[model samples]
Every structure is written in structure tokens, then in C-alpha cells.
Target: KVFGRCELAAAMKRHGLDNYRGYSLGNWVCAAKFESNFNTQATNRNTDGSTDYGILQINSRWWCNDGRTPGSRNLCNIPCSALLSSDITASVNCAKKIVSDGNGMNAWVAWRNRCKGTDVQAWIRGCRL
Candidate 1:
């Protein structure tokens, strides 16, 4: 699903991403803008043979299982296919697990490079939540 901006805001908030791991909802909003552009089915292959999946672009190499990545930890215990679903809950949960494993929002280099130091709240300005 290609979520409208505020629609994704509500989804993120509904999934408890707001203030999760001390990061604001705007932080997540900004990350999604850069990472997946709010498309739940988005996926990107890294040069190293690892792939990123879903709205949060969870890594196939370290987070989810794709049955292809070498030495995959499968730490999230979820199939990479699950991440591309429109439901988004699995991707959201895996993103949280990234934080639970101590990476925080910095886990995403895209987030670190673009959203990390910006006025992320602008990304959520019109969101009702």
C-alpha cells in the first residue's frame, strides 16, 4: 500500500512507534519518508547481496530471513516476504526489534544521513495524531 503521509502517521502511531525507544513519531515519519516513501511493499537490494524490505526497509542480512543471505541471524524470526505485505505490522514490529537490539533509529543509515538531524516534525505537521 502506498500510504498518504498522515495516513502513515496514524499507522505508525497506532503501531506504538510514537516515542518508541525515546524517538518521536516525527523521527519515524522522517525515516519512512527517506527509506520507503511510505510504500509498504518497497524493497532494495544492497550491494553486498543483502536486501532491505518493507516500509522500514528491514535488513535481510541481519534482521529477517530471506533464505539467501549468508550468515543471516534471522534475529527477527520472520520471513522477508512478510515484510512486503500491506499490513505493515510485521515490518513495524521488526523495526522495533531493531531498536530493542540497541540500534535505535540510527540503525537505518538513511535515517542517520537525512532525517537524523533535520526538523523531522515537519514530516508530521499535518498528521492529526
Candidate 2:
């Protein structure tokens, strides 16, 4: 099923606070903007000429190595392979990890550095809502 922002918010509230531990909403939104513009179904053709899938633009090839196959029926609790997934909280945390790598807001700072004068900040700012 297609999940909306409220769905994501609720899921994030439940899953994000306790488990992922170290990330900000700004960081998550930044990664989401760069990755898929918050489109959960976003997909792209990869450099290897294969299709990448899902909200985070995670490639099936990469995810397969992690065992989380996008577009598959078996995914739950943030697939081991996928960064952004049906699991909203996991996706947010995954995005956070991608940005910070636990380096204390490195991702947020880096993303801000690149997006400050661009439209990407609009995407990042909106997440405050």
C-alpha cells in the first residue's frame, strides 16, 4: 500500500526515537530530497544500466546483497539491504546514517553546505512541518 506523510510520521515516531538513536529530522529530509524527493516509489536506471528502486533510490543489486529486495512482498522492519523502505522510520534512520555515519551531524552539515543556495533546502526546510 502507498503510505502518506502521516503514516510515515507515526511510523517514525514509533521506530525512529529509540532504535536509530542519533539523527535529526533535517538530516533525514536532506537525504530524502537527494535520494528520491520523498517519493516512496521513486526508482531510477542505475549506472550498471539496471533499475534502482524504492523511496531511497536504493538499488536492487545493492539491496539484494543486504537481503532486502525492493518491490518484493517479503520486506518488513526495514529490509536489511534497503536504506529507504516501506518502513518509514527505518528509511529515515537509514537516510540519517547515510548523512552522518555517526559523525555527529556530519551529514546534516554536509548536506546544508551543498544545498544552502539551491532548491534542495526547500525540501529540507519543509520537513519541519
Candidate 3:
């Protein structure tokens, strides 16, 4: 479920995520690029032994679980694999919950370090959104 930047932008728009939770589409798009490069099936093993899932790289420690990870909070109440599918609705919903919890993009360290305060518009250039 790899997607080009424009395709992802279109999907975000279609999902009403262009400015979801007060975060701009460019901001989200930038985070997605750094998190998983827009690949829905992406996953990562964290140093704390937790795993990150999907395009947004939601963590198993506080969000979804991949079954192998024990003691997860499972805040999203979804299987980690559910976020890895081509359909991004579940992932988006989980992300909205994360933001509503006051973490905003700060929950994503990648967003804090790589996307915060950067020229995110470049991420959505020519997308026609």
C-alpha cells in the first residue's frame, strides 16, 4: 500500500484530513514522509522494544498492538495490522484520538524533530489540494 505523495495528499483530502485536529495537511504530509514514506504496510522496531505501525507509525506501547507485543495500552483498540492496510480510515481515526489527547503531532517524535517548524508546504507542492 505504498502511495506517492500526491496520491496520499488526495487521500487525506478525501478523508477530510487536510486540516484535521488543527494540523495542516502539509504538517501531516511531512510527518508521514518521515514516519513511513507513505507506505501503509510500514512497521518499525523501537529501542524500547515497542513497534511503530503504518504510515503514521502509531506505537504499540500506547496505541495498537501487533499481538506479539505484550502489555500494550492498546489505546486505539485495534490490531496493529489494521493500520497497515490500504484503507487508512482506522489509522486516521486513531491519529485524531492521539491529537485530541493533547499530544498533537508531539506524539510522533519524527514530527517534532523533522517536521515541526519546517517548510511543510514543500511536501504538498503541486498536489492541487
Better of 1 and 3 by TM-score: 1
**Best-matching candidate per TM-score:** 1
Q: How close is every model to the real structure, measured as TM-score?
A: 0.96, 0.46, 0.94
The 0-to-1 C-alpha lDDT of every candidate, in the order given, reads: 0.88, 0.46, 0.88
Tens digits of lDDT, candidate 1, 1-129: 988889989999999999998988889888888899989889899999999998889998888899899977888899999998889889888888897776678898889999887888888897787
What TM-score would candidate 1 get against the native? 0.96
Task: Residues 27-95, candidate 3: write the lDDT tens digits.
Answer: 888889999999999989988888999999999999997787777699999988899989999888898
Candidate 1, residue 22: the lDDT equals: 90
Error of 2 at 110 (Å): 10
Q: How does model 1 fare in lDDT?
A: 0.88
